[PDB]
Design a protein around this ligand. Structure first.
Ligand SMILES: *[C@@H]1O[C@H](CO)[C@@H](O)[C@H](O)[C@H]1NC(C)=O
Ligand SMILES: *[C@@H]1O[C@H](CO)[C@@H](O)[C@H](O)[C@H]1NC(C)=O
Ligand SMILES: *[C@@H]1O[C@H](CO)[C@@H](O)[C@H](O)[C@H]1NC(C)=O
Ligand SMILES: *[C@@H]1O[C@H](CO)[C@@H](O)[C@H](O)[C@H]1NC(C)=O
Ligand SMILES: *[C@@H]1O[C@H](CO)[C@@H](O)[C@H](O)[C@H]1NC(C)=O
Lengths: 348, 348, 348, 348, 348
């Protein structure tokens, strides 16, 4: 008649099979399921989530008589009775773990048990606009149901421990329904653009801006072609860095990969013409690629030196005119593309 | 009547249900719980801690008669009797393991058992001032308690194996109480600023300082615009390196990220004007961006060469005046910002 | 006579041995096996796959009488009866996990159970043309069969959750047959060349293109040998980066590794001749490596200075002729190799 | 009477409790415990070790009569009898695993069993002199002992599989005793300085040596300030690389961190003065930072050009004198510090 | 009399102890053990291998009478009978896993069971010549044998799935014998030298050759010391990269590290002497480190300029001669050293 004696009696029954007496239909109630994201992967688009629920079903066999046993509750080990296994069918690698080794059983057979579910969900989000991205990620909650025997799951409330897990920030977790009366949790994911804008977008804009004014450096004075080659080799690192944390899957892929690619060609073309124009300034034409006697003598030499100075001046100004013509065309075209490229990344 | 015979008799009872006879209230005593930090993550703000405790509860069923059995203690396997499962409810991924496979049981039912708890706590610390940061991290210790059945947990002492786990240094571990009589361990975390100051802050200050005096290099002599472009590309690496180990979550985010961001723009602007001023020195105006006969002839040539030298001197001094004006404005503004920027990071 | 009572009776039978009564031949039916790739490794050529199947066999012992028990189905725990263990014999590290802890048993002995198989397959794909690569990867599904006792596996349908897992894209998963009536799944793997072309191939082409026109820089003006050394040191990084994600196994290894290797030698050879030609321009020969009185005096000095200018001009044009001769030979040879090397990588 | 029948009889006894009949004091003999280090972490100062022991205790209950059973030994599964669990109390994450699933039991109750213990020890070593470092690391071996019941452990011999695990080399493993008769293994750890000296110390010495003679480059000729800025940006990488594998805990921290820090300031100061002296050479003062008629005319111009040459010479020599004065002061101070700094790192 | 009834009868016997009736000597036959390497570590010299064997022993108790039971084979679960645990004693972290959950038992007691063994072997290979390295790696296979009870293991055939696992290529796996009749598998490991050569040795040789030819650059023209300092920084990066993936244990350590160190010292010395000679050319001596009137006046000025030009020419030619002498000596010594070191790395 002791409460522990009552607990021992229920264990000796060994009711390790589900309560399927009533048409093999078990309504399992899961009120106040708590959601939390542990980490979100950007390259693999995988979301790791933790689900802490409070399962509550009915076990008719685990119900004693309140007259012989004057008690209203008793707690038994989880492995001595049947316990449902909640699953996340939408994602991969779902695992359910018992929060505690004991569960509460009431006098009428109702069983209270809390579980913790860790699952990895292959999240699909429109990453066309990195970093300005965000999409709803469905997380399904299901229990085994085969053929005639079905165990419907009833969800009541969802509370989310919202907070950034890194680059991604979780905004909400709402309860919705699927087509065939399937309960799933709609998780809202957003990217904090404070970090990607400063580390990737701003240096890219500043580097391209430095290239536009890099034409101010005179061709003869030097420090221009070497100045531009460092800018170009900096975008090669940007392409490798950017590609290491972004999925180039297919349609609606991140456009910043295309934007970086176009800038690399634009900077290479800018260096290409400057290198050619340097030869034009030094040589005067683009053919490298294609296959009283004493007092009068000094006057002849002095005018010859002046003519040598004059031909240097004229050959160094014709190349400047081509450089000025290209600079006007390049900066307008570059600024037009930069505004258009950025405008697509925020409003398309 | 043998002690081993007594031990085998207790195992044959199979008391795998908790001692809930007395109103289903089990006071579990946990004196001298020892705490230690294994590692602390800065980017994800996660703290890994190990908790070695000595659980001590009362099992009335596991109590023999000292007359028939003249013994005062006996040790049984942990899996043959009921053992409480201590949890860390505040954090994620809590797991309790048995230090040994045996536990001591006294003649009056008292059971002595030591457990080791490994938990991962999502620590919230004000990282606004990196590296000068530190905050108290709560670690909760709880046992299962559902509905009527409650198992209050009594804690006595906490001893911390204080010591740096890397960048973070653990200072203390004090015992406090929550609102609903919940025992939690208050952990003090501090960042050793010896490392971050030397590896990140000092090179940043020196690079900006070298930029201020980089204006001493003459525009005509060269080695200035190329000198500055290496400094600018160094801060791009600093932004990427710094962003890889700091959480850009939201309000009260690390301000060194903004401080590095401002310095990058300042160096770019300094290089931008220098390239423009170089064109002014070489060209004389900012229009590139906008769309006795023998003895007397030698005098005319000689004065012409002198005039060519004079016009070079005057155009190379007007650009110097603009460079000097900018240097006075830039170095004063830069030093004012640097002192103000650093002052916020230590006293705000 | 209760359904739960029927379930308890079947558990008490303890039928943990396989149904081998009929000639020890168990036909195990596995309809609608679902395939999905979790990740594909390029360097180690290992494919990680998840297999979700619905096993369905016959257990004659687990069949009750529908007259005494008026029920058509019942669910028992998976660990209380015998369950086949599906294997992936082709690959390493195969592990089978039960999706749920319950399985459905019909009145005639048929048992329905769904399993999840995670295996790591050593995939062999012709990676001669990176990125343009793709090959069929066999995945075998087998059940234990030793000596006389054989358990044939019957497969009906395969449905694949096709989608890129990173650099690799899964295209299909078809059901085929091996020699000895062995069922295996043919998995089609393809590499999305959008990423590898942009991050590796395009910068390589642009760098080599910049080297071809780098000969436009005059030898005397400077900024050429230093310009080329940055290009060569950039290819050293490309070799190390490319080698870190590609297997250099043997025959039909990635040819881009050889293509990068040839480009490094070609760019080095271009720098070697340019540095030698710089000495020729400055010195005039390749021997460094080998072991009225007042009015008439000024005329002698003036003609001497003119002759010094003339000898500088003639020695600076002879080196230009050798540079022009090499440039014509180098660009045609470089363009011919670049087109030929790329042509092999796409159509061989 | 069969040996297997005798083995089955001992299993049927189910003696899963410890042999505590004799005053609950069990002398457990562990001769020839073998030690081996798997890996040593330098940044976290954690040592991973493997311990292969041969446990040998006495079980009086597991002793048969040699008359009825004419056998002297028998092997039983480890899980059918009681087996002690050896622990490493000094370190974290201690786990004991059975080498085999069988153990030898003699006719008198003696049981022979070999176990493998993997533990992670928080090693404290004086890393003030990196790489020239080495200290004794204690590894404690303990068995559960609570209250009255104590199981003393007897250790006889220790044999170590000495060998380098990477940067650290294991030298010995000796058996010592603690205060309260506690057995612990003293492990000697040494750092092979062949690797750290070559990868870090030698380039640092060579870079600083190159800076000392970098003053040989003339200020006017160029190639000096740009030469020094590459040296300084190289020490920024050294600080970050060295900080990534060294614990900056507190007192007696690696002094090479400070040595690198001092060298960075020294190189920055060397570049700082050179940039200022370059302005002095070009300008002549440090004020930038602070706020017969035909035949006689040619003589006036010629002497004017000579005077312009003379003033350039005098202003280019005054700055040389300051550069020479600084070079003498800098190279003696640098060599004095370098010899003193290295002397502390080897003999302090 | 049913086959499943026979299996149930054999399971109910509970023969979980070894067949030790006959002198406690169990001959365990393991024919056709299959070997495969999963990965080989170069820095830690650890080999990961997988062993798939077919164990076959004799269990006299598990033998029925063919008259009462007209069957020749039956399959039982692996956990219901005794199964040997094969071990890899030579290496660390040995773990045996059952391929399937069923094993075949014949009418005469013979039991057939296949196991998979994963072990990590501390491989010792002579890495003096990287990448041209290769050595035989022993892998021991053993079963528990303590005191009187010995279970000899008989091996018949070894088949290896040879194939490169990365940088290392497995060549063979032959069966040999140890001193005390111990069976071990001799594994041949070879390094595919194409990848390490192309990634490390060729760039090093090209850089050294570029340094050798860089003496062609004139001292006055500039662009020489920056070239050499970039080469030296690249070689420092090479040293760090090479040290990051090679074990510097002791005697017979990789000599490529010493080769890189010597080459770095040679490059630093070349840069040092180049800077000293540049100072000598600029100054004329190594002392920086050590502590008719109108018509006649013009003639005096011109001869002064001529003398200045002549003294500049001579002070440049003396330094050119010294540079030529050092270039000859350095190129001869460097070629000799390179040939000697390559010969040592290839054939020593
Ligand atoms: C069983 O009793 C509990 C305790 O109050 C109650 O919450 C639950 O609704 C009851 N269920 C039924 C089916 O009566
Ligand atoms: C049980 O006995 C132990 C042994 O001294 C003692 O510490 C404990 O307080 C006792 N508990 C009770 C409830 O008597
Ligand atoms: C057993 O019954 C199920 C239920 O319809 C059926 O699908 C299956 O084919 C039956 N098997 C046999 C062998 O009759
Ligand atoms: C038990 O027998 C073994 C077998 O020789 C022996 O080594 C051991 O010392 C004996 N122990 C006792 C307590 O007699
Ligand atoms: C037992 O029978 C099997 C089946 O053919 C045979 O391979 C094996 O050699 C037999 N062993 C003995 C000891 O007779």
């Amino acid at each position: 008649t002791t409460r522990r004696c009552l607990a021992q009696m229920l264990i000796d029954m060994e009711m390790l099979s589900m309560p399927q007496d009533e048409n093999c239909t078990l309504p399992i109630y899961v009120p106040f399921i708590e959601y939390q994201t542990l980490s979100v992967n950007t390259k693999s688009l995988r979301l790791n989530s933790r689900l802490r629920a409070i399962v509550k079903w009915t076990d008719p066999q685990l119900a004693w008589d309140t007259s012989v046993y004057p008690y209203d509750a008793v707690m038994l080990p989880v492995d001595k009775i049947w316990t449902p296994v909640l699953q996340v069918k939408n994602g991969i690698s779902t695992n359910m773990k018992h929060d505690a080794n004991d569960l509460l059983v009431y006098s009428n057979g109702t069983v209270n048990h809390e579980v913790q579910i860790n699952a990895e969900i292959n999240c699909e989000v429109n990453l066309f606009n990195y970093p300005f991205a965000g999409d709803e990620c469905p997380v399904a909650i299901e229990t085994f149901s085969s053929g005639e025997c079905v165990t419907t799951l009833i969800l009541d409330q969802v509370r989310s421990l919202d907070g950034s897990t890194g680059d991604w920030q979780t905004t909400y977790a709402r309860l919705k329904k699927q087509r065939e009366d399937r309960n799933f949790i709609a998780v809202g994911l957003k990217i904090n653009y404070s970090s990607p804008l400063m580390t990737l977008l701003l240096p890219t804009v500043l580097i391209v801006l430095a290239d536009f004014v890099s034409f101010a450096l005179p061709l003869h004075g030097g420090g221009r072609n070497g100045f531009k080659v460092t800018l170009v080799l900096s975008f090669v690192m940007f392409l490798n860095l950017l590609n290491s944390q972004l999925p180039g899957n297919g349609d609606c892929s991140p456009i910043i990969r295309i934007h970086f690619c176009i800038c690399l060609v634009l900077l290479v073309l800018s260096m290409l013409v400057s290198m050619v124009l340097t030869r034009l300034a030094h040589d005067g034409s683009l053919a490298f690629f294609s296959p009283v006697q004493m007092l009068r003598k000094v006057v002849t030499f002095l005018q010859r030196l002046d003519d040598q100075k004059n031909q240097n001046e004229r050959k160094h100004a014709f190349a400047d005119k081509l450089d000025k013509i290209f600079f006007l065309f390049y900066v307008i075209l570059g600024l037009i593309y930069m505004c258009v490229m950025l405008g697509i990344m925020v409003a398309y």
